[PDB]
Amino acid sequence: TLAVDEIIETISAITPMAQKAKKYTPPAASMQRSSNTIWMPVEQESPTQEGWDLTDKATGLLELNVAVNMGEPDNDFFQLRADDLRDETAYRRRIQSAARKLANNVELKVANMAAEMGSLVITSPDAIGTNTADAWNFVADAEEIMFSRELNRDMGTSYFFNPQDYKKAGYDLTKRDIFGRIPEEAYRDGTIQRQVAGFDDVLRSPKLPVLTKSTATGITVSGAQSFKPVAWQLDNDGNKVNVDNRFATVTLSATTGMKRGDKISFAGVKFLGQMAKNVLAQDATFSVVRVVDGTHVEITPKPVALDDVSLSPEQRAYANVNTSLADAMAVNILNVKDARTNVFWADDAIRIVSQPIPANHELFAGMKTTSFSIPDVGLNGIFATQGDISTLSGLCRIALWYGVNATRPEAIGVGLPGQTA
Amino acid sequence: SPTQEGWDLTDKATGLLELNVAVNMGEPDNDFFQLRADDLRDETAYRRRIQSAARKLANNVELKVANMAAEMGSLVITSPDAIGTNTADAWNFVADAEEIMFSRELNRDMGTSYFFNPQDYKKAGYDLTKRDIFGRIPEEAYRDGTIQRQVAGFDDVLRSP
Amino acid sequence: GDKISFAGVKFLGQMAKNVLAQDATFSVVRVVDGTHVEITPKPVALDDVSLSPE
Amino acid sequence: ENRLESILSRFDADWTASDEARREAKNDLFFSRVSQWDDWLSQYTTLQYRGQFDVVRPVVRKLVSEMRQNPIDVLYRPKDGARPDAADVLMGMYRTDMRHNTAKIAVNIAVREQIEAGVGAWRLVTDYEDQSPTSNNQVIRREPIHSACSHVIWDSNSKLMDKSDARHCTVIHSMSQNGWEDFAEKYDLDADDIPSFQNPNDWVFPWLTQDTIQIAEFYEVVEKKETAFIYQDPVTGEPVSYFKRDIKDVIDDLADSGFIKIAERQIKRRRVYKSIITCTAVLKDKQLIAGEHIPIVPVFGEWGFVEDKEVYEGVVRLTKDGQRLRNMIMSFNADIVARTPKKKPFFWPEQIAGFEHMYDGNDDYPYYLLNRTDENSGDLPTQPLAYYENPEVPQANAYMLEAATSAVKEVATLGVETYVFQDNLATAMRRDGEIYQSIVNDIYDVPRNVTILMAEVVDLATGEKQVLNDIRGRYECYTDVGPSFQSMKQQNRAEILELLGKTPQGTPEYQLLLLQYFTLLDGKGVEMMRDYANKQLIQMG
Amino acid sequence: TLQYRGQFDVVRPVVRKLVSEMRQNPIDVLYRPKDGARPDAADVLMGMYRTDMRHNTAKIAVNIAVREQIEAGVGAWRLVTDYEDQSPTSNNQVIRREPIHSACSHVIWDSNSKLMDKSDARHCTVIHSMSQNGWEDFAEKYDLDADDIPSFQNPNDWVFPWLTQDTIQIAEFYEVVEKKETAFIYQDPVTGE
Amino acid sequence: IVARTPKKKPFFWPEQIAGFEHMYDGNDDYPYYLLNRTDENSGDLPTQPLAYYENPEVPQANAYMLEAATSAVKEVATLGV
Amino acid sequence: ENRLESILSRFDADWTASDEARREAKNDLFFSRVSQWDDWLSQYTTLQYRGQFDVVRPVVRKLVSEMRQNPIDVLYRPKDGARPDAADVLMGM
Amino acid sequence: AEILELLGKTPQGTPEYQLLLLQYFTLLDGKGVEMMRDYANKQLIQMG
């Protein structure tokens, strides 16, 4: 048996979304007592009254907020036998592969969260390679829906194609019967362009999810409902507890065939100009976040109605939907067919909270803990090693404690080509 | 490597697995000559036959490489029609290959190579030339015969006879 | 050198384990018997419950 | 595109590229400092004797003492065709700010690390001082770096012993909680955000894992052509070249002082930028620091490249196998000595039945009695008495103890002498001198000597801050190696004594004796002698 | 199965002693005037050589070459020129000596050379191996396309459990051409006919 | 050879030390060693001198070749005189 | 915030950081000064002979005498460019 | 180095004094060695 040290490298993955996502490291000492949840305010919107005599019409101040928290460690526990030779030959390569897999898992979490809590939904009735400049139209629809809603894009925007649609865009570019500079670039290399239709970062991602179609049909809103912006509310004991602004529990006729990730739109509700409060020509799109009970769901954009008479003026200043729900409004599902999602967002919509695992303390004697800097994704974990003779082995564990958060779900989007049938 | 989540991981560790592949050599590609003392008063034929054997051995090496690559090749991109029909067909071929490699996330650090047969290379050149425009790439494909060295993101594109 | 593809079997991402949209394509390298073949990509399934985590 | 991502990619490349050498150097340092039984599994369980019969440590002690007996320090010397006093001020400044205990301690630490593991390093920093500043209310000092192998990470594309061709370097700083608070207070960071950075990632012991905090400093060198203003000095001469980046807050005040701009050239040179980082974030981005070179000076032992892969070795790497074998054999011999039955007779119980108190070890009897008969066999069988064999050290054990000791002694012979190590330290000190000259030119106040006196040309801005003015005629001296002196007066005394050692008893001998009395320290009697020497020299003219 | 494999060196002290002995006796060029020339005709050349060879890189390269000569049998170094502005030697330029590691596998001399110093060698190829960042550096310095990663005959060998090795290779091919070229005979207005 | 080789210890029949096994474990609590004498079927325990496992030994060939190899290296690793 | 708590935290951090070296140094002092037989866990038997035939103490004595034969004291010297007798007062003090 | 090599082989005549003065001339610079070199230069000039 002849054997060498030559390695046949087999995989090489890329992690653009995790790299681009901002990473937050709040103080662990305070986070320990705050139950790993920290609250951040939201940009304040003020009401407006016009007239001369405004007696007893003075409003109040209302500032809503969101909350960001984390999950559980994403470890690489594995036991290593000392006597075996195929383990000594493989230990260090296993450590390297563990680092790469942890980075890949972080990227997968980012992509899935972005594609599942993306309020803005752009859909197409056919494939991208159907008409000329259809990929450009797909990007421009997203850019226009972000522009019309007046969403803050100071940090920057991003658009991630899946490889199939990226290839379709390149094919559309190269079938132009001409060669300027963009067509020659799209011919020599597969890249369409670094900036398209107003986005300042257009990339392709191999780890974008596939949005399986929803079997839900014939669902109507059960009972007229009103959702009111609020910052805190009183609990049973009278204490004021904060309220997250990126959720709203609606009651439907029956939540069968719905899951986390589907996109819905009620018949009648229309988007607003956020700051200016002008009715748009586009249907309001929501993403169902959690299917609680059997007749309720939780949608991520809270549907504050401009025509709601039960809203105080300061609450109505935050309205993003031109009307409320009226006990019969049929809800149309938007993902009626499987499609690998293209995902666009504002760069300050997805963040990655991270925390240390203080296993270097004097409490954990008998085991050695050091730090472990993940490449690609810029994160820290711990690398802990312990021994054992009850099995004559050693345990190695690479732990990483973080959590992806979507602070502005109204900024993230989802592109769905070919949503016919 | 496998991966798992959670804080308490008692009796949930994992072993180490390292797979391997086998590489082998075949039999030599020989060439025999037999000559008498009479036939070496010129030696010109001797040297020429030596050089011809060198060239033939090189060509046989490349033929073996071509056959092995075309036989033990997993990924296959099939098209229902020829490569000369409709526009950008060859580019679509190369893009399909690059896209399937990227989606499978295979390692391409050492470079990627595409090889056309002479007929398909000619059809790709014809596709470029008939483009009803001559900016730089159709002009090159018309004056010379090459389409381009890099196509659809592949690190190199050649024509194997 | 024959190229085959089993129905209902699709490629994976090989790092992220995401189901691709392309049917898995194998190449036979040797026909040992009248009922046995040898395919060069070993089809390690993802849903196989007999596979250890490693 | 991300600055953090680029920094981390470069650091990861270097960290993975310098991996094997780092682990071997860490193993050598641990072996020579903590314990020779570097086993992570036998730190528990049922115990067995494991001795430490060290035979390599005296060699390391002897080499360290031999290299400490010969101190080495930078020596600045004038160039060719320049003024003969072109290095007096620079040498005085160097001796001024390198006479403190910190510089000597850092050099000694680096030297010890170079002998034991194979690589050491130190750092040059600039700090603000007001009580005793060297020049321009600043001081330049030398700081130590412990475990340079796992704490200083160099550019992978470097092919020089002193790493002068490297373009970036990552230094990992480790500090306690209070130290991190001090660091954050000094660099205007946030104390609540505790940083972290990659660690050596070893197995050896559960302890030595002190609860610390790691941060990274990324030094990068950029070589570029920058605008430089040629001025006219209103006190002497005319051609005087200044850099625009330095002369930017006093540009208006230069004209008021009396400088008139003559031309504007583009001069190529290097700048060093430092970044304070963690893995997850960048705290300080591109803080420009003084000097042209990265302020880290490495010292190497046996250094080279095998296959584009750096290898550095000390004196302990090759003795490890023999030392471990020797320790194992001694432990086996100790186990043999103790857990072995002694030499005692073999008795049937019937033989000594009834006389059992005659064999317990007392000396109350003149002989030992035995039973003779049995009631069934008539007579007890006769067999010569046997004694348990004495414990013996196996010939294999003795032979291999001798062989392992001899092998360690044979292989632990650096050189014939530490000449190669001293030459490597001299190379490191030459690099240190280059770095210090660059920093002095950048921040200090170097007075130009005119043959018509030291003319210090400076100016102040509206914010009461003084900006140094250094002409481009700054590299008038080069670097060499000489004996370590605490002051220029000591250097002059040594030179005078060396000259007196070779000058015969002529009139120059009297001249040098008077000069030696001149250069003496002060009491009262030596004060009188120095006054006499002064008077005699002035009288002789 | 794992078996004991010790290492009891007895050659390494000899190499250390030889390297120390060769280090105790440095050797450098010395320019001397020819026969019948001015007695100080080599002063300027000697001064310039010392000025641009007094640095650290020259000594380091010589030491590396000496160590490789002692151990493997062959070493090498290179002489390069660069543009310097702050402290030039002459004509705003400097001449510096640089090291070559693994000269046996990285310097490939002309096969038709029968001289120890290889002065009759007429071509010589140097293989430069670098990683990604080193390749970016090389392309930026020599004005090359950093996108198109180069490749060449790899002179390295994966014989140790190294986690990674250099993957980018390039070659510098020096050739010497001896030819008759036109010269102009002028009249120097100062003195020189 | 030094490591993996059985040590020098006596060879015992189980019946010779049956009941006295704690006298040979290496302790120092007894003044002698007792051995059984009688067998209920064989009458008397057969007499034979006690045998011991031979001590580990480095072969003469190993010693000679180690010395010869070291001497050859010392003789051939002399650059010049 | 509490001065007591800050001081105690600093002291505890340093005390736990220097734990191993202090233990080894205390063991070295006990070994070199009092006795080389540390037998309190060995109390599961009767009384046995425990001799002390030192061979390390003469080495320590020789080293101490050698370092005592060469006294070292501070010496103040004037800085470069200062007055020649700038350190006489400090040296006298 | 060349002056020292000459001085090591020149017997103690007038060339010995010449070479000693030359070495003092070519010596490095401080303050005391500056005075010695100035004296050597003056002596050489006065000797012609």
Rg (CA), chain C: 13
- Whether residue D446 contacts residue D90, with contact meaning beta carbons closer than 8 Å, is answered with yes
What number does CATH give the domain A211-339+408-416? 2.40.30.240
Kindly report the number of other CB atoms within 10 A of residue A141's CB atom: 19
- Whether residue A73 contacts residue A401, with contact meaning beta carbons closer than 8 Å, is answered with yes
- How many angstroms from the chain centroid is the CA of residue D89? 27
For residue B9, what is the nearest residue in chain A, using CA coordinates?
Answer: A77
Residues B98 and B110: their CA atoms lie apart, in Å, by: 15
Residues E10, F79: C-beta atoms closer than 8 Å: no
Of A79, A94, A179, the CB nearest to B1: A94
Write out the two tokens for A367.
């085991």
Residues E48 and A278: their CA atoms lie apart, in Å, by: 80
For residue F67, what is the nearest residue in chain D, using CA coordinates?
Answer: D403
| DSSP letter (8 states) at residue D451 | -
- State how far the alpha carbon of A215 is from the alpha carbons of A257, A333, A337, in Å: 5, 9, 10
The phi and psi torsions of E97 (rounded to 5 degrees) equal -95, 135
Evaluate whether chains H and F are touching (3 or more beta carbon pairs less than 8 Å apart).
Answer: no
> Residue E123 contacts by C-beta under 8 Å, 6 or more apart in sequence?
E110, E173, E174, E175, E176
Residue C24 carries which side chain, given as an amino acid letter?
A
**Considering only CA atoms, which of B123, A354, E106, A363 is closest in space to residue D308?**
E106
Contact list in G for residue D92 (CB cut-off 8 A) is 80-81
Q: CB of B10 within 8 Å of any CB in chain A? A: no
Q: CB of C8 within 8 Å of any CB in chain A? A: no
- Whether residue D418 contacts residue E19, with contact meaning beta carbons closer than 8 Å, is answered with no
For residue A358, what is the nearest residue in chain D, using CA coordinates?
Answer: D211
Contact list in B for residue E151 (CB cut-off 8 A) is 111
Interface test with A, best of B7, B11, B16 (most A CBs within 10 A): B16
**Considering only CA atoms, which of E131, A23, A24, A19 is closest in space to residue D15?**
E131
Helices (H) and strands (E) in chain D, counts: 14, 20
Contact list in D for residue E63 (CB cut-off 8 A) is 161
Contact list in C for residue B4 (CB cut-off 8 A) is 53
Residues D506 and B47: their CA atoms lie apart, in Å, by: 85
**Considering only CA atoms, which of F8, F59, D41, D404 is closest in space to residue E4?**
D404
Of B17, B71, B100, the CB nearest to C1: B71
Residue H14 carries which side chain, given as an amino acid letter?
T
Of A13, A210, A340, the CB nearest to C15: A13
Residues D492, H37: C-beta atoms closer than 8 Å: no
Exposed, middle or buried: residue B105 (CB in 10 Å: 0-12, 13-18, 19+)? buried
> Residue B5 contacts by C-beta under 8 Å, 6 or more apart in sequence?
A71, A72, A73, A74, A75
Residue H4 carries which side chain, given as an amino acid letter?
L
SS (H, E, C) chain B: CCCEECCCCCCCCCCCCCCCCCCCCCCCCCCCCCCCHHHHCCCHHHHHHHHHHHHHHHHHHHHHHHHHHHHCCCCCCCCCCCCCCCCCHHHHHHHHHHHHHHHHCECCCCCCEEEECHHHHHHHHHHHHCCCCCCCHHHHHHHCCCCCCCCCCCCEEEECC
Residues D309, E67: C-beta atoms closer than 8 Å: no
Q: SS3 of A271, please?
A: strand
Write out the two tokens for D327.
């320790």
- State how far the alpha carbon of D340 is from the alpha carbons of A314, D48, D390, in Å: 92, 15, 9
- Whether residue A29 contacts residue D192, with contact meaning beta carbons closer than 8 Å, is answered with yes
Of F5, F28, F52, the CB nearest to D389: F52
Token match 């050692």: residue?
Answer: D501
**DSSP string of A75-123?**
E--EEEESS-HHHHTTHHHHHHHHHHHHHHHHHHHHHHHHHHS--EEEE
Residues E161, A83: C-beta atoms closer than 8 Å: no
**Considering only CA atoms, which of A348, A339, A342 is closest in space to residue A192?**
A342
> Residue D175 contacts by C-beta under 8 Å, 6 or more apart in sequence?
D182, D183, D212, D213, D215
Exposed, middle or buried: residue E180 (CB in 10 Å: 0-12, 13-18, 19+)? exposed
Residues E16, D302: C-beta atoms closer than 8 Å: yes
Q: SS3 of E127, please?
A: strand
The phi and psi torsions of B79 (rounded to 5 degrees) equal -125, 140
Residues A204 and A191: their CA atoms lie apart, in Å, by: 9
- State how far the alpha carbon of D93 is from the alpha carbons of D17, D87, D455, in Å: 39, 10, 17
Contact list in A for residue C16 (CB cut-off 8 A) is 13, 104, 107-108, 206-207
**DSSP string of D120-173?**
EEEEEEEEE-SSS-SBTTEEEEEEEESSHHHHEEE-SS--STT-TT--EEEEEE
> Given a contact as 3+ CB pairs under 8 Å, which chains touch C?
A, B
**Considering only CA atoms, which of A230, A226, A225, A227 is closest in space to residue A60?**
A230
Contact list in D for residue H20 (CB cut-off 8 A) is 503, 508
Evaluate whether chains C and E are touching (3 or more beta carbon pairs less than 8 Å apart).
Answer: no
The phi and psi torsions of A381 (rounded to 5 degrees) equal -135, 180
> Residue D502 contacts by C-beta under 8 Å, 6 or more apart in sequence?
none
Write out the two tokens for F9.
């210890």
Residues E135 and E151: their CA atoms lie apart, in Å, by: 11
- Would you put residue B2 in left (φ > 0), alpha (ψ -120 to 50) or beta? beta
Q: Distance, in angstroms, between A88 CA and closest chain B CA?
A: 9
| E76-83/E93-100 β-pairing | antiparallel
Evaluate whether chains E and A are touching (3 or more beta carbon pairs less than 8 Å apart).
Answer: yes
- Whether residue A175 contacts residue A191, with contact meaning beta carbons closer than 8 Å, is answered with no
Residues D228 and D233: their CA atoms lie apart, in Å, by: 15
Of D96, D178, D487, the CB nearest to G10: D178
Residues G66 and G81: their CA atoms lie apart, in Å, by: 38
Q: Distance, in angstroms, between E70 CA and closest chain F CA?
A: 9
Residues D69 and D421: their CA atoms lie apart, in Å, by: 13
Q: Distance, in angstroms, between C29 CA and closest chain B CA?
A: 7
Residue E42 carries which side chain, given as an amino acid letter?
A
Evaluate whether chains C and D are touching (3 or more beta carbon pairs less than 8 Å apart).
Answer: no
Residues B71, C27: C-beta atoms closer than 8 Å: yes
For residue A395, what is the nearest residue in chain B, using CA coordinates?
Answer: B13
